Design a binder for these strands. Structure first.
Ligand SMILES: [Mg+2]
Ligand SMILES: [Mg+2]
Ligand SMILES: [Mg+2]
Ligand SMILES: [Mg+2]
Ligand SMILES: [Mg+2]
Ligand SMILES: [Mg+2]
Ligand SMILES: [Mg+2]
Ligand SMILES: [Mg+2]
Lengths: 117, 55, 56, 151
RNA sequence: AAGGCGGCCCCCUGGACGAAGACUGACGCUCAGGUGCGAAAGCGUGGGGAGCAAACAGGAUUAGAUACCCUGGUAGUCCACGCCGUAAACGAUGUCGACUUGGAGGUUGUGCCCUUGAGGCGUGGCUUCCGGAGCUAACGCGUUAAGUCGACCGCCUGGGGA
């Protein structure tokens, strides 16, 4: 519908899932896709392949705005950190910048207890 | 000799992300790494140096 | 880690440069460490154990 | 294969065209140690394939073989309790052995009147890349491109 | 001093160490009783409450599962003023003093020497690893002793009961 051309690839990579949100330069969401919503659950949801298809489903959902160049922003650990960026370049996008935006506290909140598994 | 005002020398002992570089990498003396860290923190507060590579 | 993709530089090299910038900054290591709570006694025990291992 | 590093047994060439690759093919089709009846099925299939595809008996085999020949395959590996499929590039020798094995297996799973007819119609399907044997290379491909991250 | 103490800035304040002389002139060491301090949890009154989390609730696992795992979550964890007086409060090693081969570091003073954008030679305080004699049941300890001696104190006398 509208025209943007220069976007931002916001990827939330957690241990359990990968949420891929394509936004403009100002921070307004254009389209999104997740590994869990792409037909993957539990064991398969937390895989770099499920994150690859999440980058692919997200690319199809935003190409009506017509994005040519996009800068990537990687948040968190787990799979789909690099497999999402790889699937975005192969989809037909020019990667401007790759930035790690993982939140790191300067020693703030007490984290939950260690899991005794 | 070390000062928070000398952001010229100070910028050599801080990383790309703004983090203070450990003495094991820079090869500085123990007494002066402490003097450095204080100056970097003094300069950070006075917005002469950043805290993070986001702003 | 802020990585800016250079002119006539392939995507494969830019990503490998980013992965090394994250490795240098200790992005994944600081997240692993902060995931769960660690008692002052435990972090003091780890620091002593690592100092003993740094003697070969 | 733990300590001992072995090579590969060099088999005698094809008695008809002197091809070592066809000798691997006759042996793959061969059952119950019946070589006489195994080459009889391979030659009758090649005679009916070349006639119904425009001669070149060796070349008509190669056209059907080029389509079933896989480039990459997955290798099962258990690192930390979890079974990861690592995509690995297959060697030129095994590339042909898998290609020949799937042709024989797909022809065996067919419903035609004879094995010579089953083999010929499987090689005809492979030459135009539209059969059970080419789909086995296709399924192997989709499995490799999926686990491309763990390469 | 032990408990313990970690962003940055100031104010109030305790101890340690070094260099050079001057001053007092045994004023010292140890300490039953006594006094003070003393992690966390807990208690009282009033605040505060983001995260975490006893109890408790729900979802799972399991033969059962009053657990481990998950979703929640109250006290509590935070502040003021009181209380409590205990810990594997550990170096499981009381304090003070004198004496007894060495090696490699770390940290903090200070005397000296050089044309120094560093090093060379000493001399104190603290600290880590290794090790000699000696010691030890062995493990180990080894000038920061568990070696060689002296002063004073605390304490032990088979296990369970306690
Ligand atoms: Mg006098
Ligand atoms: Mg209270
Ligand atoms: Mg819980
Ligand atoms: Mg209460
Ligand atoms: Mg006691
Ligand atoms: Mg000895
Ligand atoms: Mg020793
Ligand atoms: Mg008794």
């Amino acid at each position: 519908r509208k025209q943007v051309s220069d976007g931002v690839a916001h990827i939330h990579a957690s241990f359990n899932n990968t949420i891929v949100t394509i936004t403009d330069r100002q921070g307004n969401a254009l389209g999104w896709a997740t590994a869990g919503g792409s037909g993957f659950r539990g064991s398969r949801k937390s895989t770099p392949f499920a994150a690859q298809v999440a980058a692919e489903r997200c690319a199809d959902a935003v190409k009506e705005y017509g994005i040519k160049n996009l800068e990537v922003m990687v948040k968190g650990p787990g799979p789909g950190r690099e497999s999402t960026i790889r699937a975005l370049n192969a989809a037909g996008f020019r990667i401007t910048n790759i930035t790690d935006v993982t939140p790191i506290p300067h020693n703030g909140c007490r984290p939950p207890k260690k899991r005794r598994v | 000799e070390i000062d928070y005002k000398d952001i010229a020398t100070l910028k050599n002992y801080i990383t790309e992300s703004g983090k203070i570089v450990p003495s094991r990498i820079t090869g500085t003396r123990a007494k002066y790494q402490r003097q450095l860290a204080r100056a970097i923190k003094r300069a950070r507060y006075l917005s002469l140096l950043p805290y993070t590579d986001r702003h | 880690p802020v990585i800016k993709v250079r002119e006539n530089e392939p995507f494969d090299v830019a990503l490998r440069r980013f992965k090394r910038s994250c490795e240098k900054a200790g992005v994944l290591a600081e997240v692993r460490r902060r995931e769960f709570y660690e008692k002052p006694t435990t972090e003091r025990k780890r620091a002593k154990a690592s100092a003993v291992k740094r003697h070969a | 294969p733990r300590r001992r590093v072995i090579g590969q047994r060099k088999i005698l060439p094809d008695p008809k065209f002197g091809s070592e690759l066809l000798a691997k093919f006759v042996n793959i089709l061969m059952v119950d140690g019946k070589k006489s009846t195994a080459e009889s099925i391979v030659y009758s299939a090649l005679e009916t394939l070349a006639q119904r595809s425009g001669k070149s008996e060796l070349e008509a085999f190669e056209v059907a073989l080029e389509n079933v020949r896989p480039t990459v395959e997955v290798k099962s590996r258990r690192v930390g309790g979890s079974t990861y499929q690592v995509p690995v590039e297959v060697r030129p020798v095994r590339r042909n052995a898998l290609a020949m094995r799937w042709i024989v297996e797909a022809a065996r799973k067919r419903g035609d009147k004879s094995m010579a007819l089953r083999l010929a119609n499987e090689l005809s399907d492979a030459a135009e890349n539209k059969g059970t044997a080419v789909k086995k290379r296709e399924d192997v491909h989709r499995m490799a491109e999926a686990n491309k991250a763990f390469a």
